[PDB]
Design a protein around this ligand. Structure first.
Ligand SMILES: CCCCCCCCCCCCCCCCCC(=O)OC[C@H](COP(=O)(O)OCCN)OC(=O)CCCCCCCCCCCCCCCCC
Ligand SMILES: CCCCCCCCCCCCCCCCCC(=O)OC[C@H](COP(=O)(O)OCCN)OC(=O)CCCCCCCCCCCCCCCCC
Ligand SMILES: CCCCCCCCCCCCCCCCCCCC
Ligand SMILES: CCCCCCCCCCCCCCCCCCCC
Ligand code: SF4
Lengths: 142, 101, 309, 169, 162
């Protein structure tokens, strides 16, 4: 199932390409209402082939959506037993790598913080260690 | 026809009327005020409830007149309760009352 | 237009109205106490004003009559079940011959609140949660009456005043102890209270039936539940703790003290005791509490007939 | 004061809405786990986190599920403007699609900043005009054009002279 | 106690008349519950206090709950009979209505002309019903227990899912 995992399935372009504009495009109310409409009968127009699942309605399999961050997972249940599940992610995509190409080596550090926001300086550490490798810096012991 | 009995009847009537009117008036005020902009085990459980509730009503009638019925009434109610408990044990053992098999 | 019969009639009517008003205000104060423990009267006035002046929005794809009817059941069922409770000599609303039978009638009507709310709330998860909640309360209403029947057997009548007068020497909690614990369990389960709080929480296929109820309908559900605790505590007092009978204090003081104690005990039971699983709850009910009530009634009858010379 | 589109009870209703506010906290991102009811029953929506494009419809849907009157607090730079995430997958601010009553800067704000948001919203409701019923009176809301919190606190802020030096804890 | 009987009987008649001519199952069951409440009021007006108590406890409070359970479980959302609405077509209901009216006139003619000193309304308590139940009607009690057992076994054997 080679489908999109960060962006929605109705997305045009591949954002980590160099010719893709990084900064946010203009807000359209009409696209917001279109996406709300797609959320309206998402369950009614649920095809379990667009998620990699199988045996969609044996007349005993139930398909549900669910809700550390908020994310969806579609559940195939035989009664109460889980037969298959596909966790739908990308609802928290912040473009952090694309931002890494838009900030200097110094001014990217707060973005390292906001990835894994329970970590803070833990998330700072690998980035500054890799930049010090690029710069040829050996930090002192303190 | 005692005045205490008719007074209590009036008090009960006023209690029910004022209570239902209070609920209805509170919902009417909530509506008017403010501006604007399945498994078969459920059947099994409810059916067991109905059957055991009728057998419960039999025991309800027994309980208020136990002294007037004597020991023979106790024997009859003991047979009734034993049959009821045998049916309950049967339902438990065949998995009818087991919610998660 | 002056006559002492009419004075007696309006005096009893005033007593009943006072009893009703104290019960509703005491349920509201129970709501405040549970919200605070887990001015205050001004806070409840503000909340009541907010429920008044928030728009009441019935769903478009919901049946309006059933949707509006479920909160009236959840309020009025147990709030009318209070009417048999004698709080003091000469301070009962109705001295019914059926009595505790009238409490059973009101509980049997009370199951329609959860059933009607779940059906009218046009949602499959809410419907399944309502089916689970209704199955639970039927599973405990199946033995509520028999746990009461031990006390009825001892008193020899259904009248609440006769039950209280039969508790003149020994309170019923000592002989009818198993009836007492089964009645406490079933009265907690009938009011959908902790630990029987959310039977829909055991599955993501189920949601609460209080969901999609907003404004004064949600307020009606809340106040009706708290009034249900008030009347279940008062019935527990009148059936198992002598009612208003006490050695030195005035009778209403004793009744109010016992009712307040059981109200706070239900509060700490909610705060302390954890939530069992759904199948565990239904299995416990059907397999333990109903046979216990039947055996308790048999033993009570044998003891009564033995001590009759 | 200016407003943008028999009296004592209006103040009583405003007071009842003021000291009785039920929030619906929206998780979204790190602002929620810093700052820590059904949407039908809630009357304040607190949006605390990034408005990702995949879940801006969720925010708008659960806003439309709430009932009148409804107020919005936007916590943090993300919910205010997009913050530091002016990037392809982020909506630049909550107020692009739902109206906001109080804005709280920070990344994240403190919990006491949320408490100050609650106070600011409380007088915001306290001197606003909303219709009494759907049939009687003018059926229009009147939000008060309050003096800005930076204009009110300007003199005390400018009067600051010395601060503790940063070499201490 | 006469006014209560007449108003409750009129409410019961109107309620079942709206039961048999209604399309929504939950609405029909609601009108059925209203009819059962009215019939219990009729019971209380006559002095059959135990009967009215059991009418609310069991008939309107257990059996109608089973009906509501079944209705919400089968999820009737207009399965080709609500949209058809054949029972309100005159060619369908006019025959059985005249047949039932003829039976009603025959039965009512039989009811009239019988000697009648009036129903006193003196309460017959649950005490006396319990005395009769476990006295001269002991075998009725035990075989009614066996009857409810048979209903339990039949309804389990048929109505379980597997
Ligand atoms: C939206 C509205 C829907 C309908 C709501 C209710 C409609 C009726 C409301 C008005 C009632 C008027 C007053 C009724 C009479 C009260 C007095 C009475 O019943 O007295 C008779 C009897 C006395 O017995 P006792 O005192 O022991 O003996 C004396 C000896 N002759 O005492 C008895 O027999 C008492 C037993 C009968 C008590 C009936 C109480 C009301 C039952 C309805 C509850 C509704 C619950 C919510 C809705 C459920 C779902 C629809
Ligand atoms: C008014 C116009 C219609 C308005 C809408 C409908 C409202 C409900 C009307 C029916 C119910 C109330 C009828 C009036 C009862 C008033 C009380 C009364 O008559 O009491 C007399 C008697 C008291 O007992 P007793 O001791 O025998 O009296 C003789 C003196 N010793 O009493 C008795 O023996 C028993 C009294 C009756 C039993 C209790 C009440 C039953 C209520 C059933 C409600 C059914 C559902 C109603 C739904 C309404 C909406 C559609
Ligand atoms: C008054 C004192 C009586 C003392 C002796 C009591 C025991 C002897 C009489 C027992 C009668 C039992 C009748 C049971 C009938 C069961 C019928 C079941 C049908 C399925
Ligand atoms: C939770 C308690 C609910 C009580 C509901 C009824 C309240 C009735 C109040 C009656 C007060 C007077 C009682 C008779 C006089 C004896 C007591 C005098 C001192 C209070
Ligand atoms: S404003 Fe800062 S802390 Fe708040 S959600 Fe955005 S990145 Fe996280």
């Amino acid at each position: 199932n080679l489908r999109r995992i960060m962006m929605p399935q109705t997305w045009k372009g591949h954002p980590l390409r160099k010719d893709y504009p990084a900064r946010a495009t203009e807000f359209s109310p009409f696209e917001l209402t279109k996406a709300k409409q797609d959320l309206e009968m998402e369950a009614l127009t649920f095809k379990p082939e667009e998620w990699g699942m199988k045996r969609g309605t044996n007349e005993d399999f139930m398909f549900l959506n669910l809700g550390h961050g908020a994310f969806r997972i579609v559940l195939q249940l035989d009664g109460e037993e889980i037969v298959d599940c596909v966790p739908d992610i990308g609802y928290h995509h912040r473009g952090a790598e694309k931002m890494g190409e838009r900030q200097s080596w110094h001014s990217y550090i707060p973005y390292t913080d906001r990835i894994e926001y329970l970590g803070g300086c833990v998330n700072e550490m690998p980035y500054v260690l890799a930049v010090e490798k690029l710069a040829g810096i050996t930090v002192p012991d303190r | 026809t005692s005045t205490e009995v008719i007074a209590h009847h009036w008090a009960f009537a006023i209690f029910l009327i004022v209570a239902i009117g209070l609920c209805c008036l509170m919902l009417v005020g909530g509506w008017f005020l403010g501006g604007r902009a399945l498994s078969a085990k459920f059947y099994l459980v409810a059916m067991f409830f109905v059957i055991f509730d009728v057998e419960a009503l039999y025991l309800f009638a027994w309980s208020t007149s136990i002294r007037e019925s004597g020991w023979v009434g106790f024997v009859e109610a003991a047979i009734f309760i034993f049959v009821l408990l045998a049916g309950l044990v049967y339902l438990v053992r065949i998995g009818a009352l087991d919610w998660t098999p | 237009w002056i006559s002492p019969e009419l004075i007696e009639i309006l005096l009893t009517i005033l007593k009943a109205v006072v009893i009703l008003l104290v019960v509703v205000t005491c349920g509201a104060f129970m709501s405040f106490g549970e919200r605070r423990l887990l001015g205050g009267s001004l806070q409840l006035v503000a909340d009541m004003i907010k429920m008044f002046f928030k728009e009441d929005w019935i769903p478009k794809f919901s049946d309006r009559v059933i949707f509006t009817l479920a909160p009236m059941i959840a309020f009025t069922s147990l709030l009318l079940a209070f009417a048999i409770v004698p709080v003091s000599p000469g301070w009962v609303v109705a001295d019914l011959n059926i009595g505790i039978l009238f409490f059973l009638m009101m509980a049997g009507l009370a199951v329609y609140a959860v059933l009607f709310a779940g059906w009218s709330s046009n949602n499959k998860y809410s419907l399944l949660g309502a089916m689970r909640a209704s199955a639970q309360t039927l599973s405990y209403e199946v033995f509520l009456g028999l746990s009461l029947m031990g006390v009825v057997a001892q008193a020899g009548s259904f009248n609440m005043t006769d039950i209280v007068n039969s508790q003149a020497h020994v309170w019923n909690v000592i002989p009818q102890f198993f009836g007492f614990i089964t009645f406490a369990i079933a009265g907690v389960a009938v009011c959908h209270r902790h630990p029987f709080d959310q039977p829909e929480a055991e599955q993501e296929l189920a949601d609460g039936y209080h969901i999609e109820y907003s404004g004064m309908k949600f307020g009606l559900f809340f106040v009706g539940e708290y009034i249900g605790i008030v009347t279940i505590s008062a019935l527990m007092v009148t059936l198992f703790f002598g009612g208003w009978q006490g050695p030195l204090l005035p009778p209403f003081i004793w009744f109010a003290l016992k009712t307040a104690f059981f109200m706070m005990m239900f509060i700490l039971i909610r705060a302390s005791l954890p939530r069992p699983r759904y199948d565990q709850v239904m299995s416990f009910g059907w397999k333990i509490c109903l046979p216990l009530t039947l055996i308790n009634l048999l033993v009570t009858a044998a003891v009564i007939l033995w001590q009759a010379q | 004061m200016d407003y943008t589109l028999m009296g004592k009870l209006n103040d009583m209703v405003n007071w009842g809405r003021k000291n009785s506010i039920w929030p619906y906290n929206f998780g979204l991102s790190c602002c929620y786990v810093e700052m820590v009811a059904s949407p039908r029953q809630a009357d304040l929506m607190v949006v605390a986190g990034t408005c990702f494009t995949k879940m801006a419809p969720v925010i708008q849907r659960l806003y439309d599920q709430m009932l009148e009157p409804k107020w919005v607090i936007s916590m943090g730079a993300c919910a205010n403007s997009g913050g530091m995430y002016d990037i392809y997958s982020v909506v630049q601010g909550v107020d692009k699609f739902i109206p906001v009553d109080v804005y709280i800067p920070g990344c994240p704000p403190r919990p006491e900043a949320y408490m100050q948001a609650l106070m600011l919203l409380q007088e915001s409701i306290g001197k606003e005009r909303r219709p009494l019923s759907w049939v009687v009176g003018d059926q229009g809301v009147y939000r008060a054009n309050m003096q800005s919190e930076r204009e009110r606190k300007r003199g005390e802020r400018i009067a600051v002279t010395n601060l503790r030096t940063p070499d201490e804890i | 106690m006469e006014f209560a009987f007449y108003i409750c009987g009129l409410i019961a008649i109107l309620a079942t008349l709206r039961v048999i001519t209604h399309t929504n199952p939950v609405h029909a069951l609601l009108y059925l519950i209203i009819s059962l409440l009215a019939i219990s009021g009729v019971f209380f007006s006559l002095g059959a206090y135990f009967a009215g108590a059991l009418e609310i406890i069991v008939y309107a409070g257990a059996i109608m709950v089973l009906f509501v359970f079944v209705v919400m479980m089968l999820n009737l959302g207009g399965s080709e009979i609500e949209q058809e609405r054949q029972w309100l077509k005159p060619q369908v209901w006019i025959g059985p209505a005249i047949l039932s009216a003829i039976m009603l006139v025959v039965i009512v003619y039989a009811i009239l002309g019988v000697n009648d000193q009036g129903i006193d309304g003196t309460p017959i308590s649950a005490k006396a019903v319990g005395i009769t139940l476990f006295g001269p009607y002991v075998l009725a009690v035990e075989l009614a227990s066996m009857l409810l057992l048979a209903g339990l076994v039949v309804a389990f054997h048929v109505g379980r899912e597997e």
